[PDB]
Design an enzyme around this catalytic site. Structure first.
Site, short mmCIF file in Angstrom:
data_model
loop_
_atom_site.label_atom_id
_atom_site.label_comp_id
_atom_site.label_asym_id
_atom_site.label_seq_id
_atom_site.Cartn_x
_atom_site.Cartn_y
_atom_site.Cartn_z
N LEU A 1 -7.35 -16.74 7.67
CA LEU A 1 -5.58 -17.64 6.92
C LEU A 1 -6.27 -18.27 5.92
CD1 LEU A 1 -5.90 -18.14 10.58
CD2 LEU A 1 -3.28 -18.38 9.79
N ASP A 2 -6.27 -17.02 4.53
CA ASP A 2 -7.22 -17.32 3.57
C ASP A 2 -6.82 -18.12 2.57
OD1 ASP A 2 -9.09 -15.58 3.03
OD2 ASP A 2 -8.02 -13.52 3.36
N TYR B 1 -13.10 -9.52 -0.20
CA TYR B 1 -10.93 -8.80 -0.68
C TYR B 1 -11.18 -9.52 -2.30
N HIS C 1 -2.94 -7.28 6.00
CA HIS C 1 -2.89 -8.13 4.89
C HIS C 1 -1.19 -8.68 5.20
CE1 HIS C 1 -6.46 -7.41 2.86
NE2 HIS C 1 -6.32 -5.89 3.31
CU LIG Z 1 -6.96 -3.84 3.66
#
Ligand SMILES: [Cu+2]
Ligand SMILES: [Cu+2]
EC number: 1.4.3.21
Lengths: 655, 655
Positions: A301-302, A388, A441
């Site tokens: 959960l960025d 990412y 995502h």
């Molecule tokens: Cu991806």
């Protein structure tokens, strides 16, 4: 400290220092470290009263989270900056807080020096004296039922570089050290039953020097496209307050959400009309789809676990953002309570956006013609979560629409794959011995609306054929169709998904007002189709930790401090308990019709990796739009000078 | 005539004249008029043999459609241009052909001079001596069961202008004249049971002079954004053949589809790989959703009934397309058999498209970073179908993806609304006495694929949770998920809709080849979510005349001349009979796995008008994309010079 120009302005470096000095003094004699020092935004009622009603100036407040050596969990509270005093404080012994850049910086040296880790590297084919070639992406452990929140934990996803300039992701190792963040020690190593030694293949690299070796040569530099604005920009900034094409709003920023847009209004020919009190991204979840241990622990959960502010890139002039750019810096606290700055964290600029509208009359072969070009205003940041990259673009348009555009790039998370191991169905072999696991995502867009003022509602809008059959007096030719509007009365009603079968949209509207032409309430309509179902099952760790992600739309009553739908302190929460969105939904019975509401929208993509995504992935776009419908009585952009306009009479005069 | 540079080049003006001279001679002594004179494209097999196998040069052929005075329907045939001879000819007495610009510009004077129409205008509140103020959009009658195809018919949607520079659409009249196109006579007038006289309100206008009156003043001209390419463009054109960023293709154009892209390949480091043989828009339908008579006849198939070529705007020059532009002209025949030119019908240019990819290493605070910017290639036209504008943009990208972007603009079709008349649920009151009916805009994208060569298949791809339950050895934490690929074996299998529940995509792939990394066939994946269900019911006029529109995807065997899915001659076909898509589907049993296939995709929007759309509507976007997946073995854009690149070693050297 000196007061800011605006109650929603982020804490200055001086205010951050003032807050941490205050906290250190309050906990004098204790060994504490700073996790979060951020603006506590004024109450919605207090802000609106101040802005619109000549009401009281809200107190300038800082929210802090600290850790104390030898004490479990965290302490949090509020500092009143004007009086340099702690005014609220509490100990939360059973939670763990967001991982800062510093928190995570430390892990690689811990694992490089740990005897058990070294042993595993040797077993994996890396000699003990080459530990400087071992790297890890230090992740939150996410959640592990073996330790709960009893220790602050990271999991080290381990990789190997043959040379420091390599992209490490072609060379994952098979094992996963578990690290105590605060004690700086490895406490466990997850070792797979099937060992896979380090890949012997060349690294999959992507810098020009690597590409020259791999494909022979780079393409020549392309002839440039140059963008200039020799008379300057059309937007005007007063501190953090933006004015552009009748829009006015406050551009805020914090450690967690990154960009926060507030007090958004549109100047409708002198009548300044509220649209949104606040809009931002409030949480994310990136759940992976391999069931094999320990991969269930990949569901970052960025926003809550690392922070879109903490993670944000300094934006390097002339490159990330092309054209004439206005930049804002971001300010946070480090562990010592000293302000830290990320320069050029936000870029603000206006861009060509093609045509706004056009119409020509066939009667004189289109000589009668009007074309008006569109300009868009872009407020952007890019943040990096280990592998990412998330490029975030808040976009304002001249028809009054507001769009969020996201582009996903960076590098696939990879795990090792044996020579004869099949990656499917849970992942893709993107390079020899490299398994890129399936993942989603998902993002939680938080909207605090004020559509043409206070007292709002939300609805689902579904396209439907008439219920009357073909050949009936009511539907003789079977062509009739309408928009079925379902207004949400209670929280439970709002829990809804995108439906392709009805081309579902959602309205956020003011039931107290009426469009004098259409007779419908003024609204902004959420037009959003990148709305994946949550693939993880009900009762799964993923579904439990992200209760908001199970529906495309969740609407709940407004209360102050209802920001973060997976709870205030996300890492290592099991997903059990009434907090965040689960608390706000409650028993589903509370009124959300014609009141102060919060609209949380889940959107994103499902990523099935392919070789095109490796070793570095081309941008994948995600978008949603909020469009004025029945807000205006006509196209609000008609007073923009056309790029070309010729009338019928003018066309006649010139033949 | 001289042979073209390329077998797919549109007919030149000389070839058009040569064809019509040939046809006039063949039918000497007969009074004929020309409806269509267009390239008959070479057979797929003959073209590929010529292009890739040193095979025979295909004959240069023109297809024609003519009418003959006093004969029903049409005649059609082929002219061999080298020998100036008709080589194929047939009479089709029971069809009606596409309506040309000439066919349609005639109608207004017919209705203005018709005694019955004049009477209706007078009854409607417009004096007999003001017929010059009466206008009509001459539409196809579409289909009317009172006349079938027995007469060639238009329906005149009638409006009023107080001044010639007015936008007429605020002032529809209540009745609908039916006009014989060839006899130039009103044959009937549909009169409503409830009469509504002309609106007495001011016109809803949108030119600067009108806006000054309405809102007081225009906005000042914004400071400009200037785009320049001082070293020229990166793309190269050889005649109609484009080369840009490894893509190569032929840009064709015709009366009906407008832009046709052919022989599309990608140069993969010296290996030239086919992608598509042909891609274009092949039909449309815009079905309205009011069941009331005569509004069932509003369901224009714009491509088949008017033509995206015939309707295309001359663009305009430095306004519609901004930057450094390469233009193409379009050439057709008029009724007399004389060539006509639309200047600047297609614009070709390259544009900034933000970031292509980025990645930075957190370890050195993102000092290690690579950023590469994206350029897109755009091939565009804009056509006008009476009230509507369709802006079409074929977009090529540097990750090897191909996108079609559409922007809808122009003016709402409007019908009159009484003072106390409710427009809902079938339409919206967008202005006093103005009813804008609900409608869909649907498009049929025709793809003739050649993915990495010949012998292709298609599949639906659905995201699915593992079937194993939470807590099973197979799915312990309930997170597992995969992509279920359903390969279409027979035509029937392919008839599929977009599904939000599975985030459905479709692959077009080559089952004869294998990606050496992933083990999957090379593919282009259709990513498309603007996929409305057809709202009109089974057995409706709309559903019958557009058999393709009832599924998001229809895949059928390739045969030559399978271009137009609603039949070759669309106007006034009832929808009964085995032709177009219905013929190609047949009994659904034919093989489409590993063969020459055609993939027809239905996409678009459902429009519920709002006052924002009036009197001129802001652009509404539609998009789909075809992405290479498992086509390349790595990101194909990595040899493009980064905008910025710094390695870890370089970052250390820079201190
Ligand atoms: Cu991806
Ligand atoms: Cu429309």
């Amino acid at each position: 400290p000196a007061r800011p120009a605006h109650p929603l302005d982020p804490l200055s470096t001086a205010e951050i220092k003032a807050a941490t000095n205050t906290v250190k003094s309050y906990f004098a004699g204790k060994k504490i470290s700073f996790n979060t020092v951020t603006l506590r935004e004024p109450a919605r009622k207090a802000y609106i009263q101040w802005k619109e009603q000549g009401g009281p100036l809200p107190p300038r407040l800082a929210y802090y989270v600290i850790l104390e050596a030898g004490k479990p969990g965290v302490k949090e509270g509020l500092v009143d900056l004007a009086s340099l005093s702690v005014i609220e404080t509490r100990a939360l012994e059973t939670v763990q807080p967001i991982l800062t850049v510093e928190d995570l910086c430390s892990t690689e040296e811990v694992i490089r020096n740990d005897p058990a880790v070294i042993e595993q590297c040797v077993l994996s084919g890396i000699p003990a004296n080459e530990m400087h070639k071992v790297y890890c992406d230090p992740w939150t452990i996410g959640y592990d039922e073996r330790w709960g929140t009893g220790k602050r934990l990271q999991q080290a996803l381990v990789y190997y570089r043959s040379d420091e300039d390599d992209s490490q992701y072609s060379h994952p190792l098979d094992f996963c050290p578990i690290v105590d963040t605060e004690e700086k020690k490895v406490i466990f190593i997850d070792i797979p039953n099937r060992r896979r030694k380090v890949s012997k293949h060349k690294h999959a690299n992507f810098y020009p020097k690597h590409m020259i070796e791999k494909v022979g040569a780079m393409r020549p530099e392309a002839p440039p496209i140059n963008v200039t604005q020799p008379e300057g920009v059309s937007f005007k900034m007063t501190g953090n307050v933006m004015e552009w094409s009748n829009f006015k709003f406050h551009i805020g920023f914090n450690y967690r959400e990154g960009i926060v847009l507030s007090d958004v209004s549109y100047n409708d020919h002198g009548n300044v009309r509220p649209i949104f009190h606040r809009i931002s991204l409030s949480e994310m979840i990136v759940p992976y789809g391999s069931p094999e241990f320990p991969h269930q622990r990949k569901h970052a959960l960025d926003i809550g676990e690392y922070g879109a502010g903490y993670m944000t890139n300094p934006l390097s002039l002339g490159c990330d953002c092309k054209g004439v750019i206005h930049y804002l810096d971001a300010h946070f606290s480090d562990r010592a309570g000293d302000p830290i700055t990320v320069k050029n964290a936000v870029c603000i600029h206006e861009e060509d956006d093609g045509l706004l509208f056009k119409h020509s009359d066939f009667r004189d072969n289109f000589a009668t013609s009007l074309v008006t070009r569109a300009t868009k205003l872009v407020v952007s940041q890019i943040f990096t979560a280990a592998n990412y990259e998330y490029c975030l673009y808040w976009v304002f348009m001249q028809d009054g629409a507001i769009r969020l555009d996201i582009r996903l790039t960076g590098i696939l998370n990879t795990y090792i794959l044996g020579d004869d191991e099949e990656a499917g169905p849970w992942g893709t072999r993107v390079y020899p011995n490299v398994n890129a696991h399936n993942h989603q995502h998902l993002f939680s867009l938080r909207i605090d609306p004020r559509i043409d003022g206070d007292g709002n509602s939300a609805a689902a809008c579904d396209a439907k054929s008439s219920p009357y059959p073909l050949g009936s007096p009511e539907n003789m030719y079977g062509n009739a169709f309408y928009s079925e509007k379902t207004t949400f009365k209670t929280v439970k009603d709002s829990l809804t998904n995108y439906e392709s079968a009805t081309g579902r949209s959602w309205d956020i509207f003011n039931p107290n007002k009426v469009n004098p032409y259409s007779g419908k309430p003024p609204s902004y309509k959420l037009v959003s189709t990148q709305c994946p179902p949550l693939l993880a099952k009900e009762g799964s760790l993923v579904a439990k930790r992200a209760p908001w992600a199970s529906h495309s739309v969740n609407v709940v009553p407004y209360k102050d401090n209802r920001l973060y739908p997976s709870g205030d302190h996300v890492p290592q929460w099991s997903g059990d308990g009434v907090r965040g969105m689960r608390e706000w939904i409650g028993d589903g019975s509370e009124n959300i019709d014609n009141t102060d509401i919060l609209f949380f929208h889940t959107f994103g993509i499902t990523h099935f990796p392919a070789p095109e995504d490796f070793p570095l992935m081309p941008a994948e776009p995600i978008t949603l739009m909020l469009r004025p419908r029945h807000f205006f009585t006509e196209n609000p952009g008609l007073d923009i000078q056309p790029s070309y306009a010729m009338t019928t009479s003018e066309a006649k005069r010139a033949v």
